[PDB]
Design a binder for this molecule. Structure first.
Ligand SMILES: *CC(=O)c1ccc(OCC(=O)O)cc1
Ligand SMILES: *CC(=O)c1ccc(OCC(=O)O)cc1
Length: 270
């Protein structure tokens, strides 16, 4: 268990010191899973990447070893709260139906898709394994497109909000931080609007670890900064790695979370 509690001054300077950031980052274990933990035949058709697999203790199981598998993990939130997010790979043609089965099974109210990563949402309507997916409205904003979706399976109807973030930067410099911070804030407000014990929020792009981990880590540290007046990005990254191997994949991503939190701290202090 690693930790470096940052007050405001050290946060601003830490985000701008790439040598210390890479020294710190590359001491965090990736906690990847041994591929021989999943010896099911035909399971490789359900993974985008051979070596990015779900840690077994936190794996989401659907309800046949193959039929119940999805490359997805429950992720703890701020203060260790269980099941605040699900981190998952972007669906492939072979798993689009499993993905929607997961959304239904978990009562997921919000999906966050992080692009600058797949194609699984319908033009108007589509159905998968008993659940009907209807896009009622599309809201275009500067930083994301929000789709208000209805899920129908039998007599039950549910709402769902799908956030498609389009401003993921190639160069992770501080000028590119505001859109991500805005997405984080809009999603956490939507989640509060669901009321007590919000069901898990699904986050993905391609492998479900890099951009995904940046988004979740920022979300966690925003609550930390508001409640405690500090941020601990190292401890947060360590908690995320225990839940799913590889969360926050690159040092550039690690620095980007520091840039976002440095921005948010300035905003809060005015
Ligand atoms: C700090 C960190 O990234 C970390 C600490 C401990 C750990 O092992 C937990 C396990 O599931 O065995 C993984 C990652
Ligand atoms: C965290 C890390 O390893 C890193 C961050 C930024 C950086 O500069 C980019 C460049 O190409 O100069 C190098 C390494």
């Amino acid at each position: 268990s690693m930790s470096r509690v940052l007050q405001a001054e050290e946060l601003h300077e830490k985000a701008l010191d790439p040598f210390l950031l890479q020294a710190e980052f590359f001491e965090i274990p990736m906690n990847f899973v041994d591929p021989k933990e999943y010896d099911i035949p035909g399971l490789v058709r359900k993974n985008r990447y051979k070596t990015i697999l779900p840690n077994p203790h936190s794996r989401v199981c659907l309800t046949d070893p193959l039929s119940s598998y999805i490359n997805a993990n429950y992720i703890r939130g701020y203060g260790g709260e269980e099941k605040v997010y699900i981190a998952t790979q972007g669906p492939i043609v072979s798993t689009v139906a499993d993905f929607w089965r997961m959304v239904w099974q978990e009562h997921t109210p919000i999906i966050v898709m992080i692009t600058n990563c797949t194609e699984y949402w319908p033009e108007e309507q589509v159905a998968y394994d008993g659940v009907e997916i209807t896009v009622q409205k599309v809201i275009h904003t500067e930083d994301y497109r929000l789709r208000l979706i209805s899920l129908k399976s039998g007599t039950e109807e549910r709402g769902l909000k799908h956030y498609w973030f389009t401003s993921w930067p190639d160069q992770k410099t501080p000028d590119r931080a505001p859109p991500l911070l805005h997405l984080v804030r809009e999603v956490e407000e939507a989640a509060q609007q669901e009321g007590p014990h919000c069901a898990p929020i699904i986050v993905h792009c391609s492998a479900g670890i890099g951009r995904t981990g940046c988004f979740i880590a920022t979300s966690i540290c925003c609550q930390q900064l508001r409640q405690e007046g500090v941020v601990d990005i190292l401890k947060t990254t360590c908690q995320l790695r225990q839940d799913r191997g590889g969360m926050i994949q690159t040092c550039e991503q690690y620095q980007f979370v520091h840039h976002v939190m440095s921005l948010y701290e300035k905003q809060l202090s005015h």
